[PDB]
Structure formats: structure tokens, C-alpha cells
Amino acid sequence: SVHIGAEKGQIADTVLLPGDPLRAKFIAETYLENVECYNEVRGMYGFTGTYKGKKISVQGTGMGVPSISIYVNELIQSYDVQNLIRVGSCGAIRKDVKVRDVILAMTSSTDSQMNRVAFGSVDFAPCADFELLKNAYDAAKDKGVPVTVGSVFTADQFYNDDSQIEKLAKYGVLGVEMETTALYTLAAKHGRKALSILTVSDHVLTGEETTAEERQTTFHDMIDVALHSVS
Amino acid sequence: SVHIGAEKGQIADTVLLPGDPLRAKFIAETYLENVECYNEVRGMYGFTGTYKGKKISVQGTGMGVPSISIYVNELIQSYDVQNLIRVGSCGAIRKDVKVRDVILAMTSSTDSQMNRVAFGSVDFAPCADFELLKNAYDAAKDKGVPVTVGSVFTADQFYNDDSQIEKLAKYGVLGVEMETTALYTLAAKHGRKALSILTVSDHVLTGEETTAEERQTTFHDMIDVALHSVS
Amino acid sequence: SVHIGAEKGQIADTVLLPGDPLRAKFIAETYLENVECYNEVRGMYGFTGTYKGKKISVQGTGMGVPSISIYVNELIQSYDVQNLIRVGSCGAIRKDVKVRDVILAMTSSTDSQMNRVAFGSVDFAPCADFELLKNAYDAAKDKGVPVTVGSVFTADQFYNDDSQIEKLAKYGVLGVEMETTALYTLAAKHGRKALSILTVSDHVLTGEETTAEERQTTFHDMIDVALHSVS
Amino acid sequence: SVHIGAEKGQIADTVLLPGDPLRAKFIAETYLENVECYNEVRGMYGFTGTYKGKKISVQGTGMGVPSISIYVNELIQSYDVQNLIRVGSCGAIRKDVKVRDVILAMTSSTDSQMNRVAFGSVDFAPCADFELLKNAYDAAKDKGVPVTVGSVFTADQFYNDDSQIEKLAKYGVLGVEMETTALYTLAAKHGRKALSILTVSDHVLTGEETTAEERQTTFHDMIDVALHSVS
Amino acid sequence: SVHIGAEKGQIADTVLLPGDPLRAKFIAETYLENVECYNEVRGMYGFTGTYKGKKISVQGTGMGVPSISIYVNELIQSYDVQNLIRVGSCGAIRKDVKVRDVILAMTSSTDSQMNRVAFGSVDFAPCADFELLKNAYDAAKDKGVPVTVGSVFTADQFYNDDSQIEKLAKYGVLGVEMETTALYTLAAKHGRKALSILTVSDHVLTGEETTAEERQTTFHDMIDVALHSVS
Amino acid sequence: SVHIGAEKGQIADTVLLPGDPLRAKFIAETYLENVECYNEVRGMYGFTGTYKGKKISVQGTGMGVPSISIYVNELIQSYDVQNLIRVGSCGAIRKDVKVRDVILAMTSSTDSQMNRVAFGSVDFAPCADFELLKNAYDAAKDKGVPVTVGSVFTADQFYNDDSQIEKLAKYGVLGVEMETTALYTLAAKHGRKALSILTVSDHVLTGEETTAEERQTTFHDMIDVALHSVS
Numbered sequence A, B, C, D, E, F: 001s002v003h004i005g006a007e008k009g010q011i012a013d014t015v016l017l018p019g020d021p022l023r024a025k026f027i028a029e030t031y032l033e034n035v036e037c038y039n040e041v042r043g044m045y046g047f048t049g050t051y052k053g054k055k056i057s058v059q060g061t062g063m064g065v066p067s068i069s070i071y072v073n074e075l076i077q078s079y080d081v082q083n084l085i086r087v088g089s090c091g092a093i094r095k096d097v098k099v100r101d102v103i104l105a106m107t108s109s110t111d112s113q114m115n116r117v118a119f120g121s122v123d124f125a126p127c128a129d130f131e132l133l134k135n136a137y138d139a140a141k142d143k144g145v146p147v148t149v150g151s152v153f154t155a156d157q158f159y160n161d162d163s164q165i166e167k168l169a170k171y172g173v174l175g176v177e178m179e180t181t182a183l184y185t186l187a188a189k190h191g192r193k194a195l196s197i198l199t200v201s202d203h204v205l206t207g208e209e210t211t212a213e214e215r216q217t218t219f220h221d222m223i224d225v226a227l228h229s230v231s
């Protein structure tokens, strides 16, 4: 497959999907035994290893719907991937979404035209796989990790002048990132299972940033929750 | 409030929302102790009673987004309703959604312009309250009732010539009804909790109808699951 | 037919269509000789009777485009109805539309996506049948009843935050209701004849309500005009 | 005013609006006493004269919504024109619209974005002035001229590849031209009175053309009907 | 062809396209040897003549996308025209576009739905033929004529209330006219070559008009540049 | 700035923008004297060096509109970049676009909603800076390199099922890539200069791939043309 330089079998049934290919290294290195690096195409590194005896691959996706859509397609069609779990951050758009919370996206809103191109007059609401969602929820509660479950907002432009996230915040949307709608939709189309799990990098509407220590912490939590989300 | 002829306090914190005002009778009569009929405006009957000592109201909504939007607004603004649970049927659009399954909608797709009018360029994906969703899920599993959790499709036209539910079925959508997007959105806007729970009246794509006995059964299950969905 | 529990022949060639199923009773009872009640499905009552020897049916439609679309379809396809006349109220959006005026809608604007789904890039302007329109006009003038003839606005949401009826008022639109675009379109598609006749329940833009006595009066006028609108 | 080279008062309260500036000559010359030519800007001739003692101006508009919109604006704002009556032809899109019929447009559908730019999510249905419409109707019947009253279709492209007039024909639309939506909308916005009256140049869907003699005849009828449409 | 009353061969491979049929006279008369007038249909005059021994036709188009689209279609399909060069004016929307500048449009923005009807979800950006563009550029520089090369804005309404040319000015768009998107698109579809060359009639955003003498001058320049744009 | 880990001054006035951060290395290494690596954030490497004494930076952008939009914003706002030149490949959609041709995009079509979000009813046609465009054109012809100048298509989805590039090919569009509309628009908004220069990786519509040797060749040409495009 054009964008992933892996051979058949090198990629696990389950893949974690950080936006950052260097967080794809750090994860694979700091959490998995017997790492391999299957892809180095474009510097978007993929790694396969084991956690508790089991195969888990970790692939970087890049930023924005088009980028992740490329990898999520090839991972599914070309390497028959069964479980896809994005693990990244997001800006929070509500006061009551706290900097230590870990977000599991049930659904995602978007201003990307990726869906409107496919459907036309229908607002297509993507959907996380409820099994993968439940398992992550349980896995978080069992260990006592704080967790918020609601919707998110997949943006096309990081620096939006015509920013309606003020209106979306009023409707309950928890925060904004730039991939989930893609993951959830492509997974659903091909009959696979997806889930986004997201930490809070900052509050967008109060400007307030989170300290690097808090990020390290909840970043670690996310990955733990991730790693138990299967079965 | 214009459409509901109730006095302050007559309506419970929790309201069930069947489309059919005569199923609003049957429910209230066959399941609740000490029924009252607060509303008879338009023949869209509302009833308040108790189940296991606790107050539970039951209000008919009518068919289509505009109708339910009227009642869900007044119920929230005028009578401070905290929990809104739709209980109705839907046509299934997949072979693997079985006639005995009970559907809990995480999210809803729509061709209603209700959201596009409010947002413009954003596909707004509505969202069930995860607490009410979990509780219903648990309540179903505890008693062994079969349950599917995924997305649905809120249509504007019952008899759609330009029917894209063929394309939606391919993306995983479980079935089609005509209210949920409204409920979920209005609930979320005003900071309340909503959930749709739906039985399967028939398969739309195989034409195949379900026998009246199967309907009676899963209708009963739905209402039981409903009644435990709180706390 | 699924939503109407009538047998072949029980429904007249001509049907009046009040939104309110209890106004469907009141009309049939207070104006027709030898009433029957053919439908009690959902409590959306239909009645057939005679006025001046002639058959006239009266069917409740419910609120919003989706609801009336259901009944108007089945009435046409399943019971070959030739003449469909909605008789309901509307909120006025202009100072010069007076509380005693009776409105005959030539056409209707809408924010419902029902048409855009069918057409795409075309603004489809629905159209009253000019014969039924003329006859009602004549019938009003012959008896001296005040009558305004222009366009209306079929809304999807009764409580619209993004309310552009301020802009529509400037373009001449007389008032807002929630059914006509549906009636006019479905009638036209299947080669039948439709017309909306509407009283003014209140002014939306001046808040000002109309007294119950004025409503009783113009309600009665509407129904008289209706009853002469044929031939 | 930029596009009309007339002085205050030279233009009548009532103006006829043929698309063709040379049909603007022929009309003024063959039907009016004491003709003047107020405008020669762009060769889009305007003429003022009398018919039965009364002032009637005749202005060419050009082809398409943008063109007529220019003239209809200046005629209204700059010369306070009260009555605007388009008189042109159209291609018929139904078998039952006959070549001798004379069409009075109640309303117009369009694929022009002129309205969507102003409104956004609302399908704005333009509307003929019912007084001018009635008078023309009466004036036709009094003299026995055959007349069809329904909707039309204002196109942007004369040679449309993506032609949906096949779908519009099924919904009752009588024929296609390229101005009416503009006239009706601008008239309504500024509180003036408009009406389109149209002959049938040909059938578009059967290819069949009309003979030049039939055109001369119904062209003459149109203008007679026009000339009585006032008071 | 319906709108052009010319016989085969009377129209040149190259045609200039002024909006104004009387500027179509003035050009043909003041610049070409051995003029003919092939078309007088609608008073939209076409002329064929020679400049430096070579055939050059000059056809008036009228105002707005629909009008020019009619002529540009027939000129191409019916008379196999190879080179189409619009020569008209525009209102400038930037301070740095000077009244003496001559504008060559690389591309055009539009609120016309002509493209969205053909494409749907795709913003189609029209495109000038780079050969005709270069030649005009060279021809201007060789003689020292000041020239700006960028984008323009094809409007549907001359008098736009919802005028976003304030936002377009910020994105670099040089000025507004009402034809180019049509020319460029139809030329490209049928594999022909087009270019718009435009003088500045006024600044729209500073209200400031240009004196008639400046217009005469740059009008003349435009036509000279035009006449060298071939080969 | 969040995504670029460079200090003030480390980035040149002119930046080349390959999609591939490893082609950003190869370029900087194989063509520039005294390379520095200012950014290693996300592995999207930026390099500053000299070519013929002059500073030229080279920054990787990633795939898709959202990705390049991030870098093009920060490069402009945070490091005052004056000249931005994308250098990447594209799939060709016409037979007459040859595998050795080098494409200079005048404009770009798109199905990205990035523009429709900002404008609404306006198709915004982006625009290359004509100076940078001319210079590249000259630089190609002076050395005899084959060059095609026309429009392109910025897609959101690499694997488009609803692929209208069949219709776009008919309108003259030369090929499809996933960045240009972003570059051209953001450059224009902030008053900077942009240009895309693209090689042909393959023909999409004939499936036919290009041999690796041909890619090496035209890749080299592109970069040479790039390097002369200034002044």
C-alpha cells in the first residue's frame, strides 16, 4: 500500500493512532516489549510490539481529516486491521471539562465536507464502537481514572476565524480536535471498530494552558486505558 | 405553556416520550400506580404516576422532528424536566439487527435541516447522555434482554423517494425513525439528559414485517429497561 | 394504510385538514350531518359526513411537515382523495395583516429540507391550486368576509432562535405556520388539488395575542369559506 | 440612475417588461398613442405612451435574473414604479400546457442563487400580486382567451446539461423561463406589485416548435391581457 | 442558432465580448476595416471585420452570467469559435487597484450557482487560458501600459445588500463584474480559449467615480491589448 | 509558534513546501550550502540554507488542507515569510498532461469546505501570485523544460468513492493533489505570495504509473524551476 511500507502480517489486529509520529515512537518504546518499526515512509513511523504477550501496533496519522483518512484506509483494506484506537489530545471548550479528565468520544461534529460529499442532504453522525467504548470506560473506572463521555468537534482549520465552537460549547460538545470524524466514519463503513480517547491540552475559550507535568500524567493514563480497551 | 395544559409540579423530573398518545395511555395505565392525566390539549395526552414509589411522567410527542421539538421544549423550559427518554419503534435497515433486539441510540443522523439552520457549515452530531445510556444498558444485561448499541437515522419523510438509507446501512446505521435528533439536540442545548430506546417494527430493506406478538413482547421489554434507566 | 384505519370508500373526495384532531371533531360535529368516525389510530381522528347533501371528510394532520406529509400521502395514494384543504391558524408577521383577516396561501416559503432533498440546487416554490383558490376567494367576497391573498412561511421549529421571519416579513410574507409547503408539494406531485386557509392566532413580532372571541369568529369564517371552496 | 437614461417623470407608474428590447419597440409602436423613447442606454429601449388615455411605459429587461434585476431595481427606487408586468415567452414542460395557452405565474421555482444568498437555509417562494393576477385572469375570461394559472421555473442556464425540469414537470410546473423569480422578489421586497404573463414558444420535452403564426396570435393576446390587468 | 442571426462563416475564430452592444458597434467601427453586421437579433449586435488583415469578430453579450452564457455557447457550438476575449469594465474593491490599471483575470470567484449546479460539493475555480493571458501581458508591457494580474468576482446582483465583497477584498480579489466565471467555464468545458480584460469604472468601497476622460483612455488601451493578444 | 520549533530569523523570506518531510531533507541536503535544521517538531523537518548566496528555507507540510494550513499560517504570522512555493507531485486526470510535464497551478478547485465555511454562498477561486508564476514560467522556458499552465484539484480524500474528477477532467483541470487551495488562499489573505509547482506521479484515470527514473528527473526539474522563481 502506497503510504505504509509494511509487509503482510507486520501490523497487529489492533492499532493505536497518535497524531504525532514521534509520540508513536515514545509509546512503542516506553510501553511495548520487542518493538519493530515496519514503516518509515514519510517519517510517519509505525511500530509493532507486544503488551502482556499480545500484539499491539502503533501508527502515526498526521494532522487533519485527510491525513488520518489515508492511513485508516490502508490499515483496514491492505492489512485487515480490526481495532483502531486514536489516542491524542484536544482543546477543551467547556469550563466543566477539567484538565485531568480523559475523554472518550461517543460521536463527533465536523465542518469537514468529507461526509456531505458522500451523503449530500444528510447530516451523518459518526459513532464509536460501543464495545471498545465500554471496555475503555470500565478500564478507567476499575483503576479510578477520571473520565468524561460525550461528543467532540473535528475541525478542518486549527486557526478558525469563523469559529463556531462558541455555539457548539452551548450544545454540550466537550472539545475540539481534527481527526475523529474520519476515524469513526471509515471504521464504520468497512465494518471495523474505532474509538477516540483524548486528553485535554488546554482550554481554548479561557486561553488557559495546562502545565507539562499534567500532560505527562494524563498522557500516561490515556495509554493505559487504551491498552485495556480490548476484550 | 401553549401546547401542554399542565400546572406547575404535575410533571415528573423524568418523562417517557412515546410518539403515540394512545401508547402514552397504555403505558401509564398498564405500568404506573395512581395515574393522573395532566394534559389533554390536542389529544396528546400526558400522565403522571409512580413506579416503585417514584414519580414518572409519560407524554406523547407526535410524529416528526417539529412535533417532538415542541413538547421537548416546553417540558424543559416550562416544567424544568431533568430526564427525557423516548420509547418508540423504528424500521431496521440491516439484516443483523434482529426483530427482538432493543436499540439504544448513541447518536442520530438526519436529513432534517433543524441543525443546519442553527450551525450552517457544521454537521452537528447529537449525543445521548452516557449516564442514562449506561444505566439502560446495565438494566438490560442484568435481566438478560438482547440489546444493540449504535446510531440511528431521524428522517423527515416517512415515504422517501430519494431514500439514501441504502447508503446509511453500509455505514452501520441500525434503523430509521423520525424524532431522536430533535430530542438529543434540545436536551443537550438546555443541559438536560436524553436517550432514545427503540424496538424494531420491521425491516425496511427486506420489506419483511414483524408479527404482533413479537411487538407486544419487545414493547414490554423497552418499557422495563426504560423504567430502570434512572440512577 | 398504516396510519389511517379506514376502509375503502369511507373517505370523501374532499378532505379538510386541521392540525388539531380535536378541532377535527368540533368541525365534523358542529358543521356536518350524519358524521362517522373512520379513523382513531394514534387519536388523530378522521370523520366523514355531509354538508348540503355532499360528502366532506375531515382529518387531523398533527404538527409539522413530517406529520402532515404522512397523512396527505396515504389520503392520496390509498384513498384517491381529489381535494385537500388545510384549515388552521398562523402567527402573523406584519402589522398590516389584521387579526380578523382570513389568509389564502398562494405559495409557501420553508426552512424544511423536504424540498432540497428532492431537488438539490433548485428552490422549489410550492403552489396552491388556482381553482380551489379562486372559489374560496369568491366565496369570501360574496359573503363579505375580509380576505388577504399572499405567501406564508412553513417552519420546522416552533421556537426558532435563528428566526429569519424578520427578513421574510420585509419580503411580504404574511405569517408563519408549519404545514403548507408539505400539503402543496405532495398534492402537486400526485396531481391533486390543495389550498391552505389560515386564521391569525397572534402577531409574532409585536407579541400581541388575539382574544378568544375573535378566534371563535374567524375560525367559523374559515370553515364556511372552506365549505364553499368546491366547484 | 446608471442603466436607464430617463429623467424624473418620463416613466409610467405601470411598466411592461419584455425581455427583448426590439419587442419593446414593437409593443410601444403597435399599441400606444404618442410614444416617447426615454432610454437608449445599452440599446435596451424604454418607451412611454398612452393606451386609452392612460400612461403605460414599456422597458426591455434583457435575459436572465441579473439583467432584469438591474432594471427592476432602478425602475422602482429611482422612478417610483408601482406596477411591473413582465410579458415574454417560455418553453413548456408539460403535454397539457397547450401552445395557445397564456400563462399567469402565481409563483416561480429557480436554481438561481439570488435568494439563497439573501436567506441561507430558507427556500424563498416568490409571489405574484394577487390583485394584478386576478385582474389579468378576469380580463382573459371576459374576452374568452384561454389561460393557465400555475408555477414556472426561472433558470440560470438556457442550455442546462444537469436539467431537472424533468423532475419539475412531475410536480406541476408549467414551463421554464429566466426572469420571473427576480421580478417577483424585488417587487415584493420594495412593496410593489408584479406579475409575469407568458406565452409558450415551444415544448422543451417533446422538442416540438410552435409555428410563427401561433406566436403572433398569442403574443397579441398576452399584450391585450396585460393592458387590462390594471384596476 | 436561436439567438445569433448569422450564417456559417460570418463569425471569426476570434471574438471580443463587450457587455454593451453599442460598445460592440463603437469598437467595430472605430478599430476594424470592412465591417459587417451579421447579427441584429434582440439588438445584441455582432460585427465581423479585419484588423491588420486578420478577421476579428465583436459580439455584445448583455449583463450577467445567464446572458453571456447564451452567446458564448452558440458562438462555440454553432460557429466553432476558437478564441473568446471579454473586454469590459469592473468596479474595483481595493485601494491599490488604480483607475488607469488594466486587469487581466487569471480566475474568478462567484456567487452564481451555475457551477454548484454542475458540481455540487466542489468549488470549481474557472481558469483563463494561459497563452491568451501571456500574450496580452506581453502586449501590454511592450507598449508600457500598466497592468494588474489577479482574480475577480462575478456577481449575480448589481445591487447586493448581502455584499461580501468586503471579505473578498481582504483575500486579494481586484474587483467585481458579472460575466467572467461564465466565459471561463464554458470556454474550458468545450476546449476553447478565453480571457477577460477589464478596465476600472470606479471604486465600489470608496464610492469614488472615475472621470469620463480616464475611461476613454483605458478603454482604448484595453482594446489595443486585446487586439495583440492573439499568437 | 506551536508546531514549528524555530527561533526568530532562522526561517528564510522564501520557503519551499514539499508534502514529505523526508523530501524536505533530500532537497535541503542535495541542493543547498550550509544547511541548518530549525524544526524537528512532529518529525516535520524544516531546514534553512543558501542557494547562490541567498537564503532559502525548506519546510515539510504533511498531507491535506488542514496540515498545510497549520504550517502556512505559522510561517506567515510568526516568521513573516514573504514567498511560499509548494513543490510536490499530483495524479494527472487528462491524457494530454504528459508524465514529463511540470505543472504550474494558476488556480485550484476543491471539495474542501475550508472556503465555504469562510464565505458561504460564494465559490472562492484561489489565485497564484502572477509574479512568482511568470518567473517560474520564464525559468522553465529559458532552460527548455516542458511546462503546462492551468488549474488543479485540491481533494480532501485520497481514496474518493464519489469521485467527480471525471467531470473536472472535462472542464480542463490538469490533475489532483491535496494542498494547493490552502496555500493559495492563506497566502492571499495575509498579502503574501504563493505558487504550486507539481510533477506528475501517475495518471489516475488510465491507472498507468510512471517509472521511478522519470520521477527522479522531473522532481529535479521542479526544484530547479523553483529555485529560479524568485526575482
Ligand SMILES: Nc1ncnc2c1ccn2[C@@H]1O[C@H](CO)[C@@H](O)[C@H]1O
Residues within 6 Å of the ligand: A019, A062, A063, A064, A088, A089, A090, A091, A092, A155, A158, A176, A177, A178, A179, A201, A202, A204
Ligand atoms: N486546541 C486545539 N484545537 C484543535 N486541535 C487540537 C487542539 C489541541 C490539540 N489538538 C490536536 O492536536 C493536533 C493539532 O495540534 C490535532 O490533530 C488535534 O487532534
Ligand SMILES: Nc1ncnc2c1ccn2[C@@H]1O[C@H](CO)[C@@H](O)[C@H]1O
Residues within 6 Å of the ligand: B019, B062, B063, B064, B088, B089, B090, B091, B092, B155, B158, B176, B177, B178, B179, B201, B202, B204
Ligand atoms: N419504517 C419506519 N420508518 C420511519 N419511521 C418509523 C418506521 C417504523 C416506525 N417508525 C416510527 O414510527 C413513527 C411513524 O410511523 C415515527 O415517529 C418513527 O419513530
Ligand SMILES: Nc1ncnc2c1ccn2[C@@H]1O[C@H](CO)[C@@H](O)[C@H]1O
Residues within 6 Å of the ligand: C019, C062, C063, C064, C088, C089, C090, C091, C092, C155, C158, C176, C177, C178, C179, C201, C202, C204
Ligand atoms: N405563531 C405561530 N408559529 C408557528 N406556527 C403557528 C403559530 C400560530 C399557529 N401556528 C400553527 O399552529 C401549529 C402549532 O401551534 C402549527 O401547525 C401552525 O400551523
Ligand SMILES: Nc1ncnc2c1ccn2[C@@H]1O[C@H](CO)[C@@H](O)[C@H]1O
Residues within 6 Å of the ligand: D019, D062, D063, D064, D088, D089, D090, D091, D092, D155, D158, D176, D177, D178, D179, D201, D202, D204
Ligand atoms: N425554452 C426556453 N428555455 C428557457 N427560456 C426560454 C425558453 C423559451 C423562451 N424563453 C424565454 O426567452 C428568453 C431566452 O430565450 C428568456 O428570457 C426566457 O424568458
Ligand SMILES: Nc1ncnc2c1ccn2[C@@H]1O[C@H](CO)[C@@H](O)[C@H]1O
Residues within 6 Å of the ligand: E019, E062, E063, E064, E088, E089, E090, E091, E092, E155, E158, E176, E177, E178, E179, E201, E202, E204
Ligand atoms: N461596480 C460594478 N459592479 C458590478 N458590475 C460592474 C461594476 C462596474 C462595471 N461593471 C460591469 O458592468 C456591467 C453592469 O454595469 C456588468 O456586466 C459588469 O461587467
Ligand SMILES: Nc1ncnc2c1ccn2[C@@H]1O[C@H](CO)[C@@H](O)[C@H]1O
Residues within 6 Å of the ligand: F019, F062, F063, F064, F088, F089, F090, F091, F092, F155, F158, F176, F177, F178, F179, F201, F202, F204
Ligand atoms: N493520485 C493522487 N491523488 C491525490 N493526491 C496525490 C496523488 C498523487 C500525488 N498526490 C500528492 O501526494 C500526496 C498524497 O499522496 C498529496 O499531498 C498530493 O499532493
